[PDB]
């Protein structure tokens, strides 16, 4: 079972990557903490210092991985205007069919989100972690976007962030 | 969660004002800000960080506090310092503290106005009671029609403290239908303040 | 260095409102733009911010789903749209810009707009009826005024004798009647000996309905 993300334009099959991390924004303002994919600009993404040569949004593609467990970093955990950089210990493949979709193992992604929620729980001391879609922004930032071979591709990521974790 | 104390502060010009702001579910960071706000104006930044004055803020304003307790001090109040003050931490704001000018007790000048004939032609009668230049703000205004106490048919509002004498003024309107207004004779508003009641009245016919 | 906001708005319940905020005198893209609202007589309430480089916002949980923040870098203008308007959305809506900070804590709002009044009510815009508060005497001092009744929405301005008379003038805050219309009074105390010779006119301007009323107040 795979999460089939719609993408435009259709990414060639050789543009498949390994998701090595992502960047989150905590919801501002019920004992729950809500996170969404970061809508921050390129400079904000670069500050995580876990990317590789591939430029992408909401998800680091072909970047660096942590050693043993997921590592979450933030300049200020209590500042919702500061991004949360998440570095995965094990990457998550996103295989693009070339027919307008890129697929991700749903069980792998759920296990990844569960680990991220565990690290967020020990950081915010909470009991419920919720992932929700992007609040909005320009097309490159509201969608999971990336540069492959000099061409920009846009994949809707709403399926990747809509879930609850206790 | 930011809660300030006291809610209201009454002080004379020239003396010290101490305002408090406590963060409840915090680990403790110096990321606090104090703002001043006057009526009809946007907030003005006074203190950023725990203790750093904003650009051009006069020396009498200071901030301090560590952990969950924070204090804003005005060492010697100037007449323009009497306003509302808020604290802020990230997106949270305190509920605000209003600083008002303490002065001596002053009795109001009470006037009563019958409805004008022009308004009466529209079928509604408004009776206005004016409390002019009194202190403190607390005043009990009662309407009496043929010496019977009214209820649920009047509203009132109070001005801000006057710039010249620091007093308040109050206006109260009793609203009745023309039919109800013309079946009664004596209209009066009674103002009670500190062992003193003043009643100004008129007779509708006269 | 200023933030210029759009004019006041009047809306029915269930409708939406869009408020603009034009920045000048500083690099618009180098600061987040926040939005803070204040209901009449209440405190400040943060609504969200927007990143001007990417357009990516972060809303307060309270307004998530009803608010949309956008921007246009070509004109250095940020927009805030609030949908599903309720009566308790009546407030002054401010845009606020945090200052650059050594610790990079971008929540110190040293720059604010002047605010945009949004009134949400089922009532309809209506000019005021101005009635005289005629004088008739506390020992050499007489009180007179104007009753400004049944107008919507706020605000109205009152002057006396085209602004020539300001001493002793008290213009009270408006009360909201159960009809949904506002009503206020403006009074002034003058020497009793001037009632026969000095003319007194209250100038009531209600810009929301484009109505100006000049009322001469004569002794009764
Ligand atoms: C990531 O790496 C794989 C294998 O090295 C490559 O085929 C793919 O194109 C890369 N992804 C991007 C977006 O360049
Ligand atoms: C992801 O990494 C694995 C090894 O961990 C490698 O075999 C695979 O080709 C990579 N996938 C992509 C799409 O680059």
Do B91 and B139 reside in the same domain of the chain? no
Residues B55 and B122 in one domain: no
CATH topology of domain C129-216: Immunoglobulin-like (2.60.40)
Q: Which two three-digit tokens encode residue A146? A: 């990336």
Residue B182 maps to which CATH number? 2.60.40.10
Residues sharing a CB contact under 8 Å with residue A47, sequence separation 6 or more, in sequence order: A83, A85
Report how far residue C177's alpha carbon sits from residue C150's, in angstroms, rounded to the nearest whole number.
Answer: 8
One domain, residues B95 and B125: no
Classify burial at C201, counting beta carbons within 10 Å of its beta carbon; exposed 0-12, middle 13-18, buried 19 or more.
middle
B158 C-alpha to ligand 2 centroid (Å): 73
Helix/strand/coil for C88: helix
- A157 in contact with C, Cβ within 8 Å: no
The contacts of residue A150 (CB under 8 Å, 6+ apart) are: none
Q: How far apart are CA B85 and CA B10, in angstroms?
A: 14
Are B72 and B150 in the same domain? no
Total number of domains constituting chain A = 1
**To the nearest 10°, the Cα dihedral for B164, C43, B2, A28?**
-150
Tell me whether residues C175 and B155 touch, CB distance under 8 A.
yes
Q: Do residues B6 and B44 both lie within one domain?
A: yes
* The architecture CATH gives domain C2-120: Sandwich (2.60)
Residues B149 and B87 in one domain: no
**Closest approach of A129 to chain C, Cα-based (Å):** 15
What would the two tokens of residue B37 be?
A: 């706000």
Contact by Cβ (8 Å): B117, B26 = no
- Contact between B197 and B177 under an 8 Å Cβ cutoff? The reply is no
Taking a C-beta distance cutoff of 8 angstroms, is the pair A156, A6 a contact? yes
Instruction: Choose the final residue of a domain: B66, B101, B136.
Output: B101
Pairing of strands B33-37, B44-48: antiparallel
CA distance C212 to C175: 20
Q: Where do you find CATH 2.60.40.10 in chain C? A: 2-120, 129-216
All residues at 6 or more sequence positions from A132 whose CB lies less than 8 Å from its CB, including other chains? A27, A34, A35, A36, A161, A162
Task: For residue C106, give the chain A residue with the closest CA.
Answer: A81
- Distance (Å) of CA A69 to CA A65, A91, A112, B61: 9, 11, 10, 49
Q: Give me the number of domains chain B comprises.
A: 2
Contact B48 C112 (CB under 8 A): no
DSSP B195: S
C184 and B157 in contact by Cβ < 8 A? Answer: yes
The alpha-helical segments, DSSP class H, found in chain A are 42-46, 106-124, 139-142
State which residues form the domain around A42: 1-166
Chain A neighbors (3+ CB pairs < 8 Å): B, C
Residues of chain B positioned with their CB less than 8 A from the CB of A28: 90-91
Say if residue B116 is in the same domain as residue B96. Answer: no
What's CA A56's distance to the chain center, in Å? 10
Ligand 2 pocket, CB under 6 A:
A 16-18, 91, 93
d(CA C110, CA B44): 7
Gap from CA of B142 to ligand 2 centroid (Å): 83
B125, B152: one domain: yes
| Listed residue (A119, A66, A115) closest to A90, CA to CA | A66
Q: Which residues constitute the domain of residue B52?
A: 2-101
Method used to determine the 3D structure: X-ray
Q: Does C155 touch chain B (CB under 8 A)?
A: no
Distance (Å) from the alpha carbon of B75 to chain C's nearest alpha carbon: 23
Domain boundary among B68, B84, B101: B101
Alpha-carbon gap: B63 to the closest alpha carbon of chain A (Å): 22
């Amino acid at each position: 079972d795979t999460i089939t993300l719609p993408c435009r334009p259709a990414p060639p099959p050789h543009c498949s990557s390994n998701i090595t991390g992502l960047i989150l924004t905590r919801q501002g303002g019920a004992n729950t903490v809500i996170f969404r994919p970061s809508g921050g600009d390129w400079r904000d993404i670069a500050r995580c210092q876990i990317a590789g040569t591939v430029v992408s949004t909401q998800l680091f593609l072909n970047g660096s991985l942590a050693e043993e467990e997921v590592v979450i970093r933030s300049e200020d955990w209590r500042d919702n205007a500061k991004s949360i950089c998440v570095q995965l210990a094990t990457s998550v493949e996103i295989a693009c069919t070339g027919a307008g979709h890129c697929a991700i193992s749903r069980a792998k992604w759920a296990n990844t989100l569960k680990q991220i929620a565990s690290k967020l729980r020990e950081q915010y001391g909470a009991k419920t972690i919720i992932f929700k879609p992007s609040s909005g922004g320009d097309p490159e930032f509201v969608n999971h976007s990336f540069n492959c071979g000099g061409e920009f591709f846009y994949c809707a990521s709403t399926q990747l962030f809509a879930s609850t974790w206790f | 969660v930011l809660t300030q104390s006291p809610g209201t502060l009454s002080l004379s010009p020239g003396e010290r004002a101490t305002l408090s702001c406590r963060a409840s579910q915090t680990v403790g960071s110096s990321y606090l800000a104090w703002y001043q706000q006057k009526p009809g104006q946007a907030p003005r930044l006074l203190i950023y960080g725990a203790s750093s004055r904003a650009t051009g803020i006069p020396d009498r304003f200071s901030g301090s506090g560590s952990g969950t307790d924070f204090t804003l001090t005005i060492s010697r109040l100037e007449p323009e310092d009497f306003a509302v003050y808020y604290c802020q931490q990230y997106e949270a704001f305190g509920q605000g503290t209003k600083v008002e000018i303490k002065r001596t007790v002053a009795a109001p000048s009470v006037f009563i106005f019958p409805p004008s004939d022009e308004q009466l032609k529209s079928g509604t009668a408004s009776v206005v009671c004016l409390l002019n230049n009194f202190y403190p703000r607390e005043a009990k205004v009662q309407w009496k029609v043929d010496n019977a106490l009214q209820s649920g048919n009047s509203q009132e509002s109070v001005t801000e403290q006057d710039s010249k004498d620091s007093t308040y003024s109050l206006s109260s309107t009793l609203t009745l239908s023309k039919a109800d207004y013309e079946k009664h004779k004596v209209y009066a508003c009674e103002v009670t303040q500190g062992t003193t009641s003043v009643t100004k009245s008129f007779n509708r016919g006269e | 260095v200023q933030l210029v906001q759009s004019g006041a708005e009047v809306k029915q319940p269930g409708a939406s409102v869009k408020v603009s905020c034009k920045a000048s005198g500083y690099t618009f893209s180098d600061h987040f733009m926040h939005w803070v609202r204040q209901a009449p007589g209440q405190g400040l309430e943060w609504m969200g911010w927007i990143n001007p480089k990417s357009g990516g916002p972060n809303y307060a949980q309270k307004f998530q789903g009803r608010v949309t923040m956008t921007r246009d870098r070509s004109i250095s203008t940020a927009y805030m749209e609030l949908r599903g308007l309720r009566s308790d959305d009546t407030a002054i809506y401010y845009c606020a810009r945090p200052m650059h900070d050594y610790d990079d804590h971008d929540w110190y709002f040293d720059l604010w707009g002047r605010g945009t009044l949004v009134t949400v009510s089922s009532a309809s815009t209506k000019g005021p009826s101005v009635f005289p508060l005629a004088p008739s005497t506390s020992g050499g001092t007489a009180a007179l005024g104007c009753l400004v009744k049944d107008y919507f929405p706020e605000p109205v301005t009152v002057s006396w004798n085209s602004g020539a008379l300001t001493s002793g003038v008290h213009t009270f805050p408006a009360v909201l009647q159960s009809s949904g219309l506002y009503s206020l009074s403006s009074v002034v105390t003058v020497p009793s000996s001037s009632l026969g010779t000095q003319t007194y006119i209250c100038n009531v301007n209600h810009k929301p309905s484009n109505t100006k009323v000049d009322k001469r107040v004569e002794p009764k």
